[PDB]
Copies of this chain bind each other. A is one copy, B any other.
Amino acid sequence: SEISRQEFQRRRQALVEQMQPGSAALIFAAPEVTRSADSEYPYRQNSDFWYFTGFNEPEAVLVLIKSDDTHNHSVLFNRVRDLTAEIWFGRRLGQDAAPEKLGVDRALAFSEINQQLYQLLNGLDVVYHAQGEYAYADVIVNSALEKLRKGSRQNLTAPATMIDWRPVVHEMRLFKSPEEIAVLRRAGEITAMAHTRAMEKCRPGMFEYHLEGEIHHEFNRHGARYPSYNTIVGSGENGCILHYTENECEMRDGDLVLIDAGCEYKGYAGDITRTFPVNGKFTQAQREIYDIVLESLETSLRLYRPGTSILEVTGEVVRIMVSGLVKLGILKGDVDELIAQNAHRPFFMHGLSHWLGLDVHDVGVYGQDRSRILEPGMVLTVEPGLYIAPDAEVPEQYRGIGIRIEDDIVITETGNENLTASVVKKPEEIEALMVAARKQ
């Protein structure tokens, strides 16, 4: 699936539509980042810049100029074609091909931005700029504005109003188009296959990073070159640590392994979590905790629909978790009272859902306590979980169990579509999947 040229064009026009007449919006590309000495990390374009261009080069700036409600044009600043620096540092789009390729009216050399930007801003009333996003961008913008302010003798004037476009653009990204849903649907599929593969390849004795290897290879063969975030593979006590990326321990027979991994496909992120027994067979204790988490997820998947909210659904999940924990003796007391005092937090300390899109923890206003009413087009995760520390004062057989199950969904007119249901989560289906894989 792909984001078409028509769509990129459409997004720009949707932004211009909200801009005041006599203004310009400046969107900067992300800077290259050093990994060590003279080597850089694989380039990752700025999500907002990507959203409007699908252009994967640094040192580029998109300038949308709105003259009035019926006239507007675009100018792109990007690296010049250097049939010398390209033979040495990869191909560049250049100014000649850019107009047709990216659908912009004009393209200029990034090396000329300081001599050209102020001329584009001269006389405008408003400039839309994400101040503070990038230092190199603020230098360029401030430099241009200063030049205009001090150039009255050259008949230059600077726009006195600067508006951060992030709130507007992020509200746009919060609602996915059909094209975006198709791409996210594919990212979910690819991510699901990777998780399925991890469960099938897992064997006691293997190291956590081995499953990471399986997952990344699967992402890659489907065209999703990079993960959308650092892969987590925590078996045993490591599963109780939410930010466990070391993936250095040997997986033991009898332990559970929690895997949170997602690919980045065409810029969009997949975000799946599956927890399963390293030896392919849930013990009674593990199965008891798992069922509570699964009930939470299945219930949430049933509840999420237009009209409700993350906060509301979270309330249902808290009740389910407290009830379950009381039944097992992990929590003692009256359910409603325990809920009233959030007695669940020691075991479920993170949110149930977060937006998903060009960023795994996507942009968009959540509302106080994530109470914003859900509408069709919003994409979010559903990731309930229970983590019982090795030293928690609870029945012995539950200590050291970390479980999380996470799916990605898109809100629809009548409810929601689960984009990652293609990888099993029911305990019996997991054990059957692993058994089938093991007889080879």
Contacts and interface: CB of A to CB of B under 8 A. Distances in A.
Interface of A: 30, 33-42, 44, 46-47, 86-91, 131-132, 142, 145-146, 149, 152, 155, 158, 160-164, 166-167, 207, 209-210, 212-214, 216-217, 220-221, 223, 225, 228-230, 240-247, 349, 358-361, 363, 365-366, 368, 387, 389
Copies in the complex: 4
> Considering the complex of A and B, which 6 residue pairs feature the smallest CB-CB distances, nearest first?
A213-B220, A217-B217, A89-B243, A160-B164, A37-B359, A90-B243
Contact of A87 (B87, B146, B217, B240): B240
- Most chain B CB inside 10 Å of its own CB: which residue of A132, A240, A247: A132
A399 B297 CA distance: 59
B230 A221 contact: no
Contacts of A142: 131-132
A349 B90 CA distance: 15
A323 B244 CA distance: 57
Contact of A88 (B34, B41, B243): B243
Contact of A91 (B41, B145, B246): B246
Contacts of A225: 209, 212, 247
A131 B366 CA distance: 30
B39 A230 contact: yes
A433 B391 CA distance: 54
Given A221-B213, A368-B155, A39 B87 contact: no
Given A132-B146, A216-B216, A220-B209, A35 B44 contact: yes
Contacts of A229: 35, 39
Given A90-B245, A213-B220, A213-B221, 14 more contacts: A37-B359, A38-B361, A39-B228, A42-B245, A88-B243, A90-B241, A132-B149, A152-B366, A160-B163, A160-B167, A162-B163, A214-B217, A216-B220, A217-B217
Contacts of A158: 164
Contact of A41 (B35, B38, B387): B35
A212 B220 contact: yes
Contacts of A217: 213-214, 216-217
Nearest to A247: B225
A87 B242 contact: yes
A332 B217 CA distance: 47
B220 A37 contact: no
Contact of A360 (B39, B160, B360, B368): B39
A358 B37 CA distance: 10
A126 to B, nearest CB: 9
A33 B36 contact: no
